[PDB]
Amino acid sequence: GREQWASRLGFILAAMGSAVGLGNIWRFSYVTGENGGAAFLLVYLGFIALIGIPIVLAEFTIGRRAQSDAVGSFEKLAPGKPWKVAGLMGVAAGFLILSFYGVIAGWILFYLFNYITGQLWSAPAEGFGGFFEGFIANPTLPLFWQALFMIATIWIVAIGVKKGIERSNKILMPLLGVLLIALAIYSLTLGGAKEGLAFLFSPDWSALKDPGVYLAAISQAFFTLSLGMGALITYGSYVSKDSRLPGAAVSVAGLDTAFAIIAGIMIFPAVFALGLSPSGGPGLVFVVLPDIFDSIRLGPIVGIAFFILLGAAALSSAVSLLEVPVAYFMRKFDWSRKQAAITLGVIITLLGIPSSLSFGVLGEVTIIPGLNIFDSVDFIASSVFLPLGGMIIALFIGWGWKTSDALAESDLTDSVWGKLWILSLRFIAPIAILIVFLSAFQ
Ligand SMILES: CCCCCCCCCCCCO[C@@H]1O[C@H](CO)[C@@H](O[C@H]2O[C@H](CO)[C@@H](O)[C@H](O)[C@H]2O)[C@H](O)[C@H]1O
Ligand SMILES: CCCCCCCCCO[C@@H]1O[C@H](CO)[C@@H](O)[C@H](O)[C@H]1O
Ligand SMILES: CCCCCCCCCO[C@@H]1O[C@H](CO)[C@@H](O)[C@H](O)[C@H]1O
Ligand SMILES: N[C@@H](Cc1ccc(O)cc1)C(=O)O
Ligand code: NA
Ligand code: NA
Predict the structure, then answer these.
(1) DSSP 331-376
(2) DSSP state of 239
């Protein structure tokens, strides 16, 4: 009873729905902001092209060939071999990443609720920054909107692959892109465009001397592509032979990059027009954008539409996050999808609660030295587990497969592009990750 995408376009739009989410707007902005901007972006773009695309194709190939979960794919294609540690790490990353992903998405629903009830049709007396600090520091209020978002997440994963994940609305992501474009154009007119565009596209190579920039660039690349943890193995495991994987990987990588770049064109000219620091942190878009929406006449309608379309993109991403533990637990314990979605979704919600409290009453607590709970959970998943799982995945096809099977299953020949892809997995991508690890950690 293995489920398959009902529609022909279902797989590619699901992969696009998995990639495009909070990482393109919320995470891309604040990580680019504190990492220096343009020099980080160039390294980030280079990581997309040379590591992101091939390992995305690597995940599609493994999933479609094995027709199993992120862990069962390795047990099936190479029984009794150590490659399944990437599937195990990938399942754990699903727990950790979605635990805090639900919190940031709860921030979305809260802001949408405030616009729908008219609470943000003017700058609150304490300011848009003071409004944001007051909400995220509340111990209970973000939990309610986080729990509300997870209920929707679990509901769609429980309904199934054909009736749930696939049937998300096809106009909302294009409407999100059109809206970001319209906004990015508006922020160009606001006065901080020259300095904001120099920050984003004129590189200061002094920042590159710190190795941590490379680690953040590769963490954002793996994060924004839903990469390295078997999420695309799982989505690919639902598609049949009537599908071209190379174009799917480039389309997903191209669209996700376009969303990221246009988000930066919107955010940072707005950052500089406001005179705010680009290095503010995780609440950057939540302080900058409502202030930006407030200078528009119809801004409250822009805010409603923005956090509706942003919330819908976060929803399709959270669904693919929960889908990795659910498919793994459906097989290995004969759990029903509704049981696994509800049980694992409830547990992941509980795991995120400390990360939500980390923005307030637990703000002084550290797990990894110098990082609070939220920053620690993100670091182990995005900077450790995603890049390492991606390194294993690339080496698996590179050295654990025969080349003819690698090319045949990926719908490639022994062409220049086919040779380029096998070379990326054997050497370029995995040694780039290893070098990033070696230099960052002493
Ligand atoms: C889009 C999904 C819609 C789902 C339906 C939601 C309807 C149920 C409403 C529950 C949320 C309202 O609950 C109420 O919200 C307001 C903020 O909005 C909170 O207000 C409180 O927190 C905010 C956060 O900064 C402070 O600015 C404010 O000074 C403080 O009073 C209330 O303490 C909370 O009790
Ligand atoms: C896809 C549609 C995108 C349209 C975006 C155009 C919005 C730019 C509005 O500029 C604003 O209005 C006046 C110009 O008309 C200026 O005087 C004012 O300083 C400026 O803030
Ligand atoms: C809509 C996409 C447009 C992207 C263009 C962004 C280019 C960023 C570079 O900024 C430029 O840096 C120079 C100094 O480095 C300045 O002398 C110059 O005045 C400034 O313009
Ligand atoms: N790529 C998504 C987040 C994500 C990460 C990993 C996943 O497995 C799924 C989703 C984003 O940029 O918003
Ligand atoms: Na993304
Ligand atoms: Na999404």
Answers:
(1) HHT---HHHHHHHHHHHHHHHHHHHHHTTTTTTT-BSSTT-BHHHH
(2) -
What technique solved it? X-ray
Helix (H, G, I), strand (E, B) or coil at 398: helix
Domain residue spans of the chain? 1-441
Q: What is the dihedral of CA 369, 375, 380, 385, to 10 degrees?
A: -150
* Run of H or E including 306: helix 299-332
CA torsion sign, 59 to 62 to 64 to 67?
negative
Q: Which token pair is 419?
A: 């040779």
Query: Contacts for 188-195 with beta carbons within 8 Å, 24 or more apart?
Result: 188/265, 188/269, 190/269, 190/270, 190/273, 190/292, 190/295, 191/273, 192/268, 192/269, 192/270, 192/271, 192/272, 192/273, 192/274, 192/275, 193/269, 193/272, 193/273, 195/269, 195/272
In this structure, is the dihedral angle defined by the CA atoms of residues 180, 50, 94 and 74, taken in order, positive or negative?
Answer: positive
Q: How far is the CA of 142 from the centre of ligand 1 (A)?
A: 9
- The protein residue with its alpha carbon nearest to ligand 3, atom 13, reads 198
- Looking at the DSSP assignment, which residues form a beta bridge with residue 366? 372
For tokens 């182990």, name the residue.
380
Q: Where are the alpha helices (DSSP H) in 67-165?
A: 72-77, 85-116, 127-136, 141-159
Q: Are 157 and 345 in contact (CB under 8 A)?
A: yes
CA distance 313 to 227: 17
Ligand closest to 203 (CA) is 3
CB of 9 closer than 8 Å to CB of 251: no
Contact 105, 314 (CB under 8 A): yes
For residue 297, give the ligand nearest its CA: 2
Please check whether residue 104 is in contact with residue 353, taking contact to mean a CB–CB distance below 8 angstroms.
no
Q: Identify the bridge partners of residue 372 per DSSP, sorted by sequence position.
A: 366
Atom 6 in ligand 3: residue holding the nearest Cα: 197
